[PDB]
Design a protein around this ligand. Structure first.
Ligand SMILES: *Cc1ccc(S(=O)(=O)N2CCN(CC(C)C)CC2)cc1
Ligand SMILES: *Cc1ccc(S(=O)(=O)N2CCN(CC(C)C)CC2)cc1
Ligand SMILES: [Ca+2]
Ligand SMILES: [Ca+2]
Lengths: 9, 229, 229, 9
């Protein structure tokens, strides 16, 4: 299950 | 520690740190910026979130490697000690983020876009605490994640369109909470499906660029639905 | 800071930190192990080198990003200030590694395999200092790299076969020093070619597993020769 | 120009 990657602006 | 640096310089250095893939530095610059006491713009909120997501994401990945080794060894004290060290560090980062949200980002956030963003963060960082928690501690931490996500959901459904990317990412992450933390896979599947379908029906209202933003997150909902069904 | 932890526990935790991709932790565990005062085995030397290569490799990559941004801006003070902060951190890591080699890894290293390994490290970390140095400082730092690499080369040519992987990696890195630092591309090309050819002629002596180890590094020499010619 | 990667034990 993946959450929002959220690692790049 | 960043008290002597100008707010605008902290923001500029957080953007440089992102480009340099220096996420610990990025998070420290954005903590300094929050501690100036002013509200954050949309772009500044994203810098804060990106910085801490990368820091805690590396900690979580390391904790999972160590936890797996520790579980295999239970089928000297060093693996447990080192897993505990990484775990404590991860908990410290989550507590720092939660403390920024509580002092005082959430209480000053009046617009739906900011308030939902911060409450989604609060749910996420309690969720990361829940991933490493064991026992009754886990129960209260789980409820704190749930309560933050639920308040964000309630605001998002009243104040934002179903394609809004924050609303979509909130629903995605709350569905992961249900599936992975709360042992509620059916609630996870129902939320992801309803969110996807209601967004699909609103895509006709969007520009080409907004369409791209919303469909990207919808694909993540679909990817989870494919894994879960 | 690691003085209260057993040597064997530091080594075990360095291996766990590698598996978790926690290279700062790995380097701190291996610094603690070196500071116990005992010589390092082959495997322990590799753990020390891997840890610091990853730490300084991330610093170097960030310094290059920031230096490029700074150079474009020279075609506020924040880019220079932050490049300087990363640069100082990188220099501190290189100084730490050099200090371990000087107190007292090199002086206790009598076998060719250990002494060459440590002198190659000394050349590498002076080379990383040279990459960020400006002016006359750069001259003396460059000469310190050169002198370390040259002593390692002299020992390696007397004491190791031309296919030995340490001898090959030393020659590879000294050739990069000549090309990138010393402004001696012809010396770089001649060293890489001679090293490759003398290794090729010795491959017949090797087992299948040693053949794989040596040919891997030979391909790196060839890759540089292809880029340089 | 590449030096020894040296990032994996
Ligand atoms: C929780 C959250 C944070 C940020 C956004 S966003 O700024 O709109 N943006 C959406 C696209 N996304 C791309 C990845 C690959 C999912 C990055 C963030 C949305 C929700
Ligand atoms: C400078 C140096 C360090 C270590 C070696 S090695 O232990 O023999 N080993 C050779 C293979 N190499 C693979 C990469 C992809 C080059 C890893 C290290 C050799 C030279
Ligand atoms: Ca000011
Ligand atoms: Ca002891």
């Amino acid at each position: 299950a993946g959450s929002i990657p959220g690692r790049r602006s | 520690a960043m008290g002597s640096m100008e707010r605008a310089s902290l923001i500029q250095k957080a953007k440089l740190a992102e480009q340099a893939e220096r996420y610990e530095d990025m998070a420290a610059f954005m903590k300094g910026a929050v501690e100036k006491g002013e509200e954050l713009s949309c772009e500044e909120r994203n810098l804060l979130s990106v910085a801490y997501k990368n820091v805690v994401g590396g900690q979580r990945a390391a904790w999972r490697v160590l936890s797996s080794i520790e579980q295999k060894s239970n089928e000297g004290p060093e693996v447990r000690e080192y897993r505990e060290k990484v775990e404590t560090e991860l908990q410290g980062v989550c507590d720092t983020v939660l403390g920024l949200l509580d002092s005082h980002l959430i209480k000053e956030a009046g617009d739906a876009e900011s308030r939902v963003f911060y409450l989604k963060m609060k749910g996420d960082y309690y969720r990361y605490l829940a991933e490493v928690a064991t026992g009754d501690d886990k129960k209260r931490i789980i409820d704190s994640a749930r309560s933050a996500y639920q308040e964000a959901m309630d605001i998002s459904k009243k104040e934002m369109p179903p394609t809004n990317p924050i609303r979509l990412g909130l629903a995605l992450n709350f569905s992961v909470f249900h599936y992975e933390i709360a042992n509620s896979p059916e609630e996870a599947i129902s939320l992801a499906k309803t969110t996807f379908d209601e967004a699909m029906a609103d895509l006709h209202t969007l520009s080409e660029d907004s369409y791209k933003d919303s469909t990207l997150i919808m694909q993540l909902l679909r990817d989870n639905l494919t894994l879960w069904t």
